């Protein structure tokens, strides 16, 4: 179990760690988060009390380094930093754990939620969507635009998700216009899976990362990407059976975890109705359809 030490908490802020969150009062004696499960990526995120605009945060993997948070009063935010001196870090947490100034990652043993939401998400793929090669962790916030959004302004601050566009030469083979537009299997299987992602695990990883950025930061471009990756599978008549079964599990846990009161903005009526009721795979997402119907019957 690993730890992320905070220098302090000088401004009042709501701190999240994965699907949990804590309110920290201005100059309350908060020095970090302990007992973080090893084996998964994690995200530590922030929303300041005095300006709820800009949710922001950091994707990290404790196996890749020792990371701590310190507030910067010039740039006005909590920054993640990497400590190269193992022993210094090791003894700091020790002082802070001994004075009981850390909250504990509150993981119920029975609970597989975070694993289920990050099953295919890997730090190495995050760092290629979020390009800042001098850090081992990746900053994301509410306002960052995606490459696709930019095409339709600062590139170094972009979310480099894979561009998906159903009315593009990439999606449509010359001579198979109607076929490819009505059945997206060649775009899914040959262009995207075999060509760009190489396998279904990397495709699901980006889909899961997009959902998590949409949920945790209200990142609208990430929400677009999540729905696009869902629609591309559901709009394909030929999908490997293991992918349909895995997709049903992935979406079930995403819909399970979504705050009920965020459904309006985060869920796109057109995509979900098409996917559950109209598409080729309308009968392949039994768990997702059941949780959607019992939890958000209005949307449909």
């Amino acid at each position: 179990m690993n730890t992320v030490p905070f220098t302090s908490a000088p401004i009042e802020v709501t701190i999240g760690i994965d699907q949990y969150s804590f309110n920290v009062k201005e100059n309350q004696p908060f020095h970090g988060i302990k007992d973080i499960p090893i084996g998964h990526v994690h995200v530590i995120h922030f929303q300041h009390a005095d300006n709820s605009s800009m949710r922001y945060g950091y994707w990290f993997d404790c196996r890749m380094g020792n990371f701590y948070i310190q507030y910067d009063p010039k740039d006005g935010l909590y920054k993640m930093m990497e400590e190269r001196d193992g022993a210094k870090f090791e003894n700091i947490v020790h002082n802070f754990k001994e004075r009981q100034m850390m909250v504990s990652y509150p993981k119920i043993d029975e609970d597989d939620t975070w694993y289920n939401l990050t099953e295919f998400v890997q730090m190495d793929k995050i760092r290629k969507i979020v390009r800042k090669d001098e850090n081992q962790f990746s900053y994301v916030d509410s306002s960052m635009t995606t490459v696709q959004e930019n095409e339709l302004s600062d590139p170094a601050h972009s979310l480099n998700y894979t561009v998906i566009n159903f009315k593009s030469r990439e999606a449509i083979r010359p001579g198979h216009e109607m076929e490819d537009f009505l059945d997206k299997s060649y775009y899914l299987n040959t262009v995207m899976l075999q060509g760009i992602f190489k396998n279904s695990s990397n495709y699901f990883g980006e889909l899961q990362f997009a959902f998590l950025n949409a949920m945790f930061f209200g990142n609208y471009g990430s929400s677009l990407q999540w729905h696009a990756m869902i629609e591309l599978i559901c709009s394909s008549a030929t999908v490997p059976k293991h992918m349909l079964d895995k997709l049903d599990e992935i979406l079930y846990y995403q819909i399970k975890t979504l705050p009920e009161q965020y459904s309006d903005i985060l869920l796109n009526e057109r995509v979900w109705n098409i996917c559950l009721y109209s598409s080729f795979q309308k009968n392949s997402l039994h768990n997702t359809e059941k949780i959607m119907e019992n939890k958000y019957p209005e949307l449909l």
Binding site: K167, I172, E177, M178, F181
Partner: protein, 237 residues
């Protein structure tokens, strides 16, 4: 975006544009089978592709063989339309190419956009106008060439005959749409008005009779009356 009454003079400016109407692509009669079930029989159809500035009609005849062994024909017909319009654009030289294609039915947008991916600078637009181009098959010479076709064929016509020698494109389009609206609302009466007078003939190379300017005024008035007379029956007003 969409073409309507606000931006209507745009049709007669010098940017090449083409209306595309797919109403008459897939044409069927519905009938009873021996077992008392219902079946369709297709007849030849046509794509109506019209430059409104010049009167140029690219009439692509859609032969019933297109449909052989195909399913979901009403869906296929939109894609076939889009395929043929794309092929037409590719066939024309650069300076004869449309800068916009206006589809009369919004369901044509996606099929045509997908077939025109190689032409990103040709705008594909819908229209809010109700245009009467379905009535093209009430024009005798157009109906005849479609029905007699034995294979896919493109036939070219000028739908304004020689009118542009004497009137503007705006006025020619107004006359065309009035005639077609009349033929659509009451074909029998409209044709009676056009052919009532033995002394007025249709040139071999024309679609409409050779009326003087003054006779066109009378004819146009009679077509307006026909349209109102018919309307007071539909709605009982």
């Amino acid at each position: 975006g969409a073409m309507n009454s606000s931006n209507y003079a745009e049709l007669f400016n010098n940017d090449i544009k083409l209306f595309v109407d797919d109403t008459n692509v897939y044409r069927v009669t519905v009938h009873k089978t021996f077992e008392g079930n219902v079946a369709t029989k297709a007849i030849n159809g046509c794509i109506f592709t019209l430059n409104p500035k010049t009167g140029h009609l690219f009439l692509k005849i859609i032969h019933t063989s297109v449909w052989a062994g195909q399913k979901r024909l009403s869906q296929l017909a939109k894609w076939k339309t889009a395929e043929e319009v794309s092929a037409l654009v590719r066939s024309l030289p650069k300076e004869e190419q449309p800068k916009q294609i206006i589809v009369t039915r919004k369901a044509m947008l996606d099929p045509l956009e997908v077939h025109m991916l190689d032409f990103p600078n040709i705008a594909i637009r819908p229209t809010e106008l109700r245009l009467p181009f379905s009535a093209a098959m009430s024009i005798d010479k157009l109906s005849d060439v479609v029905m007699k076709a034995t294979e896919p064929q493109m036939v070219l016509f000028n739908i304004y005959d020689d009118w542009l020698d004497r009137i503007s494109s705006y006025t020619a389009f107004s006359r065309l749409t009035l005639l077609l609206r009349a033929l659509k609302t009451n074909e029998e009466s409209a044709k009676m008005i056009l052919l009532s007078d033995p002394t007025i003939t249709i040139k071999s190379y024309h679609l409409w009779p050779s009326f003087t300017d003054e006779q066109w005024i009378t004819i146009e008035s009679q077509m307006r009356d026909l349209i109102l007379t018919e309307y007071g029956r539909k709605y009982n007003v």
